[PDB]
Amino acid sequence: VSMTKTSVDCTMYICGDSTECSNLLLQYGSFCTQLNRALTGIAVEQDK
């Protein structure tokens, strides 16, 4: 019926506390925004 509503943010996943890695990820435009929106949609649809 449902699975664990895992919500992996990638700002901490791809990059640790490294701020230079955060900037390098920021070079990629909206990849992590799409990923997080997709995972939150997955979680909300699990609740639904």
Binding site: D9, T11, M12, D17, N36, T40
Partner: protein
């Protein structure tokens, strides 16, 4: 976008009006408070003496 949680929600939704709900705005993070380096104690000093 950093004055208050309402402002953070507004800047996340990109809209001046915020609908009734719970919106993820940012991420909480606990910075390391201090640094510790507990290396093993020197078993024997080199024989400079």
């Amino acid at each position: 976008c950093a004055l208050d949680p309402l402002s953070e929600t507004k800047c996340t939704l990109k809209s001046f009006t915020v609908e009734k709900g719970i919106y993820q705005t940012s991420n909480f993070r606990v910075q390391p408070t201090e640094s510790i380096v507990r290396f093993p104690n020197i078993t024997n000093l080199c024989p400079f003496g």
